From a paper:
Arthrobacter nitroguajacolicus Rü61a 1-H-3-hydroxy-4-oxoquinaldine 2,4-dioxygenase (HOD) and Pseudomonas putida 33/1 1-H-3-hydroxy-4-oxoquinoline 2,4-dioxygenase (QDO) were the first dioxygenases discovered to belong to the ABH-fold family. They catalyze the O2-dependent breakdown of N-heteroaromatic quinolone-type substrates with concomitant carbon monoxide production. Atypical for oxygenases, these enzymes promote the activation of the triplet ground-state O2 molecule without the aid of metal centers or external organic co-factors. Kinetic measurements indicate that their reaction mechanism relies on a fast initial step, during which the substrates' 3-hydroxyl group is deprotonated by the His-Asp subset of the triad, thus promoting its activation for molecular oxygen attack (step 1), whilst the nucleophile is not essential.
MQO, a non-reactive molecule structurally closest to the natural substrate, in which the hydroxyl group at position 3 is replaced by the –H substituent. As crystals of HODH251A typically diffract better than those of wild-type HOD we solved the X-ray structure of this variant in complex MQO under normoxic and hyperoxic conditions at the 2.0 Å and 2.1 Å, resolution, respectively. Instead of the elongated electron-rich density observed for bound dioxygen in other systems, O2-pressurization led to a decrease in electron density at the R-site compared to that under normoxic conditions. Remarkably, S101 shifts completely to the trans rotamer (χ1 values of 180.08 and 180.66°) with no indication of the alternative plus rotamer observed under normoxic conditions.
Author numbering: 2 to 275
Write the structure that this text describes.
């Protein structure tokens, strides 16, 4: 995967990004990381798609193999960064795919890019409802310069859901280990503000000027009440669908990459037709 890793100057920042520079029929597949992780979350998903698609994975400001303190930014800046990278590469039509709170970037990317460039979207494991007491408590801890690491440990416990899942534990304990208070504190502020300002991922997607096919694919939360908000939103919106992947962790791109990949291919094939 490091075979495909590049660096370029985006506005005032040097950002890393995966590009397999595959020469083939579109759309390109834009994999969008969440907060305080990088392209390494997608290394198994990249292997599923590598052969048949151009695969781009931008890293956010202060994100990558060598994390760094950088000035404050939000999901609006993540979208502009993602699009400046696509402009530099000469990419027109793309299928955005997000993990967790990468979702705020994806939905704003759909709005900013419009349904010509971005006719569909896949959001993976993104909390569709307003924060529950537990998660609200986690964001609080992430913003506390005293208690941010305690914050991340609580989240790691929720995401692993009691599983000895070797590849996901490697991602959280080795691949996220170099991220400090600067990223995590900012993730807490941006996510807490995203919910407060947009209400929920569902309110934000319903509010798009141009609604389009979006699929939520998730393994967590596993409770029937969470599946019901997805089914109820799906019944209300012809353009919304979900699949419960039944993987063990909140990281389906890592632990069920083959399942993640068939939903991406289905949406990529639908774009290729017409
Ligand atoms: C990678 C990743 C997933 C999440 O759900 C999340 C939530 C809060 C802060 C940072 C985060 N980072
Ligand atoms: K539907």
């Amino acid at each position: 995967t490091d075979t495909y890793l590049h660096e370029t100057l985006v506005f005032d920042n040097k950002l890393s990004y995966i590009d397999n520079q595959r020469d083939t029929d579109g759309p390109a597949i834009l994999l969008l990381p969440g907060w305080c992780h990088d392209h390494r979350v997608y290394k198994y998903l990249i292997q599923e798609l590598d052969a048949d698609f151009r695969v781009i994975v931008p890293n956010w400001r202060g994100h990558g193999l060598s994390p760094s303190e950088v000035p404050d930014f939000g999901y609006q800046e993540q979208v502009k960064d993602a699009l400046e990278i696509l402009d530099q590469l000469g990419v027109e039509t793309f299928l955005p795919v997000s993990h967790s709170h990468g979702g705020w970037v994806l939905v704003e990317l759909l709005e900013q890019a419009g349904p010509e460039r971005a006719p569909r979207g896949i959001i993976m494991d993104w909390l569709m409802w307003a924060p529950k007491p537990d998660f609200a408590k986690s964001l609080t801890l992430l913003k506390d310069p005293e208690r941010w690491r305690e914050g991340t440990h609580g989240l790691f416990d929720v995401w692993l859901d009691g599983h000895d899942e070797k590849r996901v534990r490697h991602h959280l304990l080795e691949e996220m280990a170099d991220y400090g208070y600067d990223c995590w504190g900012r993730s807490g502020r941006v996510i807490e503000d995203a919910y407060g300002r947009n209400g929920s991922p569902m309110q934000m997607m319903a509010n798009l000027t141009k609604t389009r096919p979006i699929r939520h694919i998730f393994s967590q939360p596993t409770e029937p009440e969470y599946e019901k908000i997805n089914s109820d939103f799906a019944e209300q919106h012809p353009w919304f669908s979900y699949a419960k992947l039944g993987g063990p962790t909140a990281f389906p791109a890592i632990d069920v990459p083959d399942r993640a990949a068939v939903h991406i291919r289905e949406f990529a094939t639908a774009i290729r037709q017409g």
